[PDB]
Design a binder for this molecule. Structure first.
Ligand SMILES: [Zn+2]
Ligand SMILES: [Zn+2]
Lengths: 226, 226
């Protein structure tokens, strides 16, 4: 039932989904082993798609040969994962795990921006991001209780949307819910969050902790591109 | 080196350790397998004991038959764990994992209260806590980035100190650093923190999320004692 209260539904419809333009499809990858919150993720996306005719979803079994083929196409290497697409078009906007806590609002805002295919990034930032031609993966490790984590996840996602808009689609912005991916978090000594890891061509280049303002965050990414 | 800066040392000495009365001994349990931050914990306690002659420590290897005997005596069932004692006397004040983030200040405050063998708990709360005669274990799951988590950990620890003072010593207040104990956190569906689990006689009785004020927190514990 109410993973989303009826009062919440009204707010979501009025303050978020009323701003949608193009149809968005939530492609969710799940599996049978080690998916503690997979059912919650499943029901969340289903309840959200009932609030508007511009939102749809597709549940994919990562364990199947079919799911593996789809994942590869969407550059997904783990499950649970959700990529927010514009009618199936990959925008590099992904969430690994459950978007709980204030990550929920970031999830909704991401849906709107992919739908609008634009962001509120500063002009200078947009110019730089749209010029990036290298494969970049931005991992943003977060925990459910983290006031500033959403800012970092949204920044990574705005970068991905703009690069996709430019026709490159080379930036992957990945929110990673640490509680659900302990081995991955441990790999990067994640304690304080948000912890950001920028990889270029599959190799680590820059790692830092904290939600940095737009200008400083951009600077970090550009420096990793050296 | 500086897990603790020299400026930090001055603050610690002046605002915390200057208030100590009786000697405190930090008994730390470590192991070889799955102790990612064991070395950091080790160096932290060693650096802290250098700031005052009223603080000492003892590193115990949980893997050894000797360490297992000591752990049993200190009611420790996992490693890494640190119990804050008054010259070796068990006060039910434990930390499972690294006291990073603002848990560091809570760690220092706990050292002072065990040293003083008293707390700032309200009179009514003290009266009720000192009367508890049942075995109670309060688990407080936290993450490094969690503004209100320290409040809950300190409340659990103040309860343990008072019950020990009363001559009962039946309350165990356990801070559990979720990142380091994922299996344990998963067992209790820990997402939002702090998540509190109150067990009486080894069995779960009450589970809730959030730092509740003193009165409400006490109410929760008493209700589990029914
Ligand atoms: Zn409104
Ligand atoms: Zn001062």
């Amino acid at each position: 039932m109410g993973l989303i209260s009826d009062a919440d539904k009204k707010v979501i419809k009025e303050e978020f989904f009323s701003k949608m333009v193009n149809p968005v499809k939530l492609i969710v990858f799940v599996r049978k082993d080690h998916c503690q919150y997979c059912d919650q993720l499943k029901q969340l996306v289903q309840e959200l798609s009932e609030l508007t005719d511009k939102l749809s979803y597709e549940i994919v079994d990562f364990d199947t040969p079919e799911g593996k083929e789809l994942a590869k196409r969407y550059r997904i290497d783990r499950a649970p994962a959700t990529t927010i697409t514009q009618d199936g078009k990959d925008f590099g906007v992904r969430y690994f795990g459950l978007p709980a806590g204030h990550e929920f609002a970031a999830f909704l805002e991401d849906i709107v921006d992919v739908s609008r295919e634009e962001t509120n990034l500063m002009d200078e930032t947009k110019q730089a991001i749209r010029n990036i031609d290298q494969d970049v993966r931005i991992l943003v490790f977060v925990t459910p209780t983290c006031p500033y984590c959403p800012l970092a996840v949204r920044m990574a996602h705005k970068f991905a949307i703009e690069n996709t808009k430019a026709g490159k689609g080379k930036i992957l912005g990945d929110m990673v819910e640490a509680i659900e991916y302990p081995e991955w978090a441990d790999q990067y000594n994640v304690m304080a969050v948000p912890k950001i890891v920028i990889q270029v061509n599959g190799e680590d280049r820059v790692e830092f902790e904290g939600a940095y303002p737009e200008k400083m965050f951009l600077e970090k990414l550009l420096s990793a591109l050296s």
